[PDB]
């Protein structure tokens, strides 16, 4: 299926200090694989997936240096926006970056990705064309114009279409068993008796990976789009997810209502009822 590598970089400015806290988190196929945190006792790039151990201590050195330069990119970038937006360093500020690439089933380049956010709102984005920039407000024009005169896009297009692609091919090779693995949801319906001669039928789905799942309730083949309570997909903590779907249904009429579960890692869509 599709494959991706992303780097989720964050710089939080701390009032009464020159250096901001800088965190970089790398993801391969939406799963943390590497991390960096300046707050840690002896700060460096650390492996977050077991297949990341099969990397020479000189790879970590190459990467750790990169984090050190980024810390300075962020510190200077934070100072300038503080000026663009006429702000005080008496308070903390947030600069965030998301960069990486997406790959087809054939491991070929689909798109490059580079976005920035200030105070958790969009600031500047590199358009899918990897040539033009999109500024979010008036202040992001100081940066859009700055980045056109310096030709910053060219530098990124080069990496996003070159080195980013290369490295993920390596990561998808070294970790394939772990990366191509899926976990099947394990469903069941719970019965909740209530007032006015009504009942809540909650169909659960547990210990599944990846996070995408579709739970639907149906009255004799017909779907209940309306008045079907859900829950946001929550992590179990063991690397797998949970999610449930409820529907208020009158008593005795239990067997009229059917529950379906859909997920990539399933020998077929689950179909189930109460008992």
């Amino acid at each position: 299926g599709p494959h991706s590598m992303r780097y989720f970089e964050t710089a939080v400015s701390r009032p009464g200090l020159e250096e901001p806290r800088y965190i970089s988190v790398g993801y391969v196929d939406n799963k943390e694989f590497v991390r960096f945190d300046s707050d840690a006792e002896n700060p460096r790039y650390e492996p977050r997936a077991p297949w990341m151990e099969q990397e020479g201590p000189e790879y970590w050195e190459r990467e750790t240096q990169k984090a050190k330069g980024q810390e300075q990119w962020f510190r200077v970038s934070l100072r300038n926006l503080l000026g663009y937006y006429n702000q005080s360093a008496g308070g903390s500020h947030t600069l965030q970056q998301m960069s990486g690439c997406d790959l087809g089933s054939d491991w070929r380049l689909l798109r490059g990705y580079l976005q920035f956010a200030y105070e958790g709102r969009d600031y500047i984005a590199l358009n899918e064309d990897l040539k033009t920039w999109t500024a979010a407000d008036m202040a992001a024009q100081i940066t859009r114009r700055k980045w056109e005169q310096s030709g910053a896009a060219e530098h990124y297009k080069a990496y996003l279409e070159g080195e980013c692609v290369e490295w993920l091919h390596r990561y998808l090779k070294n970790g394939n068993a772990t990366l191509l693995r899926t976990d099947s949801p394990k469903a069941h319906v719970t019965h909740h008796p209530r007032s006015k001669g009504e009942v809540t039928l909650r169909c659960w789905a547990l210990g599944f990976y990846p996070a995408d799942i579709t739970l639907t309730w149906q009255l004799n083949g017909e779907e209940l789009t309306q008045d079907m309570e859900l829950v946001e997909t929550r992590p179990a903590g063991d690397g797998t997810f949970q999610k449930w779907a409820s529907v208020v249904v009158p008593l005795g009429k239990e067997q009229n209502y059917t529950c379906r579960v859909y997920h990539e890692g399933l020998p077929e869509p689950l179909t189930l009822r109460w008992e």
């Binding site: 990467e63 600069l95 980045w147």
Partner: peptide, 9 residues
């Protein structure tokens, strides 16, 4: 493997 941003903001 991460990149390094070129020009500052």
């Amino acid at each position: 493997a991460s990149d390094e941003n070129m020009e500052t903001m």
